[PDB]
Design an enzyme around this catalytic site. Sequence first.
Site, PDB file in Angstrom:
ATOM      1  N   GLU A  78      -0.739  -6.481 -29.527  1.00 31.72           N
ATOM      2  CA  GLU A  78      -1.818  -7.118 -30.243  1.00 31.72           C
ATOM      3  C   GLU A  78      -2.102  -8.466 -29.558  1.00 31.72           C
ATOM      4  OE1 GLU A  78      -0.586  -8.054 -34.211  1.00 31.72           O
ATOM      5  OE2 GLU A  78      -2.460  -9.070 -34.760  1.00 31.72           O
ATOM      6  N   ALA A  86      -3.400 -12.243 -30.119  1.00 29.19           N
ATOM      7  CA  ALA A  86      -3.529 -13.209 -31.208  1.00 29.19           C
ATOM      8  C   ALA A  86      -4.445 -14.315 -30.679  1.00 29.19           C
ATOM      9  CB  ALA A  86      -2.166 -13.771 -31.557  1.00 29.19           C
ATOM     10  N   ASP A 122      17.235 -16.522 -33.921  1.00 36.95           N
ATOM     11  CA  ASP A 122      16.591 -17.827 -34.091  1.00 36.95           C
ATOM     12  C   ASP A 122      15.069 -17.670 -33.813  1.00 36.95           C
ATOM     13  OD1 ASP A 122      18.005 -17.362 -31.424  1.00 36.95           O
ATOM     14  OD2 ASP A 122      16.432 -18.784 -30.868  1.00 36.95           O
ATOM     15  N   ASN A 176       6.997 -19.054 -30.032  1.00 32.54           N
ATOM     16  CA  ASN A 176       6.968 -17.587 -30.100  1.00 32.54           C
ATOM     17  C   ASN A 176       6.267 -17.106 -31.366  1.00 32.54           C
ATOM     18  OD1 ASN A 176       8.211 -17.235 -27.617  1.00 32.54           O
ATOM     19  ND2 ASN A 176      10.207 -17.531 -28.563  1.00 32.54           N
TER      20      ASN A 176
END
Lengths: 253, 253
Positions: A84, A86, A129, A134
């Site tokens: 996808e 973004a 984490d 990210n």
Amino acid sequence: WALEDFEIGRPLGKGKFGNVYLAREKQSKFILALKVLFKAQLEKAGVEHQLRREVEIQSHLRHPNILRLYGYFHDATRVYLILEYAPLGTVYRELQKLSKFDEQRTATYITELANALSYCHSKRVIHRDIKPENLLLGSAGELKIADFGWSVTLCGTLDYLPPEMIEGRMHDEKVDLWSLGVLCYEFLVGKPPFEANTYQETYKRISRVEFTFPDFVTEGARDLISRLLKHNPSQRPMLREVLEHPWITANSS
Amino acid sequence: WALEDFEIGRPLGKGKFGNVYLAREKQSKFILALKVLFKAQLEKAGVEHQLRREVEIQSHLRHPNILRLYGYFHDATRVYLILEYAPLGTVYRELQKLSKFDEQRTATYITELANALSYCHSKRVIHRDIKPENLLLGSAGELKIADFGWSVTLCGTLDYLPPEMIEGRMHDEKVDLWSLGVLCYEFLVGKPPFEANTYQETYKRISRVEFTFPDFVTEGARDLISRLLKHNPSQRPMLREVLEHPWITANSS
Ligand SMILES: C[C@H]1C[C@](Cc2nc(Nc3nccs3)cc3ccccc23)(C(=O)O)CCN1Cc1cccc(Cl)c1F
Ligand SMILES: C[C@H]1C[C@](Cc2nc(Nc3nccs3)cc3ccccc23)(C(=O)O)CCN1Cc1cccc(Cl)c1F
């Protein structure tokens, strides 16, 4: 699936493992992102097994706050991930632009993250984490976990193994609760809570859980962050406790 | 050091990793054991790094209850370990022969093991699980730990790591306390405490710490074994507590 099925656009990041590009599927004209990983690089670092496990996990994850893996394919030397796209970039870039986020924006992002993580927990998938670089943003401003940071004997030895060696990773499912605390703080303050000038001082601050809040952080936000940032993993709340925290329910869109 | 420096005797075990032989250094006529490991086998299993770390650790271990590594060498395809020869075989074979050990023999072996482990702990070296087939016996009947089962970051990520990811393996130093409990029981009873007909039942018994003692096991031995076999690793005694346990001090030679 093959490379020729896609028109390639601008690069969306370069690394020793893989390069990402904006792409359009030729027949449908659907916009997506293509990540190209080199098999030899993954093998040389001993990360090829880890990647296959993360890609297999990621294939079954369908949630608005998790970057979608549409599919994957390979050739002789490289693995291609069809992702996808973004359009609004990272949360890290948005935090740089705004300096810090207001309580509504922060609680909304925390909710989105806890929803994604709760959805994964129900499938027995946990995350490691989480870093804001990210975390990507969709066209409607929905945050997207985009790191793929997911996780799901010798003969005659079982009799001799202690419970901690056979019960598996006991509370590894609590790392991401600590990440929500660090992110909630970083979103409101503009910097992570344990940031220091040296590695040794940063290590000392995390290990001793030594952090303070600027005066402007409100009582509700302090309560949530203080509950998430517990040294003992088992004492961190369940994700369902985060979703029902009164600061979250009051401020989240 | 080279293979031609040694006269080879009888095999002392064969495996996919290495073969062991009785040997004599040609000049000195000193008896020892030579273990030959094939580099390709170690590499294919991804155990070559683990081996080098264990051999480096083992090089600095000088204790009467730890099998001595005199040195090592290699050629193009194989690694050779020059080891102390333990003439009286394994504790596993002795337990088969005697059925079970008396309290003096058991407390003596437990002391020897705790002494070796305490000596390693002072050098910040811990051991994993311990099996009686990896416990050898010297000419004077001293037990020898012979498994070599010893143990001693991404950019921009430290700020986001929880204490459990940076503080290292928290209580991994307590696995060998659970091993002393299993061994003390097995030595007195003739079988390990969680032995069952199936994998699932054995797993259930260890995880729930479900074990009972035959009527002949004495109060002192029960007290020590019950203190060692704690589900929570941090609640297991320190090795110094084992060495000063009244059942140990009363029965150990
Ligand atoms: C190194 C940076 C480059 C990056 C490029 C960029 N991407 C998008 N949207 C996308 N949707 C899918 C993949 S990238 C939108 C952008 C908008 C403006 C400016 C740059 C943009 C950025 O600067 O924000 C994205 C974040 N990381 C890479 C990275 C990190 C983790 C995961 C992945 Cl998959 C990844 F690519
Ligand atoms: C597979 C068995 C074979 C073995 C042979 C044997 N060894 C010795 N003494 C030695 N001193 C140094 C190395 S062997 C004495 C013996 C006396 C009688 C019968 C067989 C004897 C046994 O049957 O007891 C030893 C234990 N394991 C191998 C093994 C396991 C872990 C570590 C090592 Cl290094 C290892 F070799």
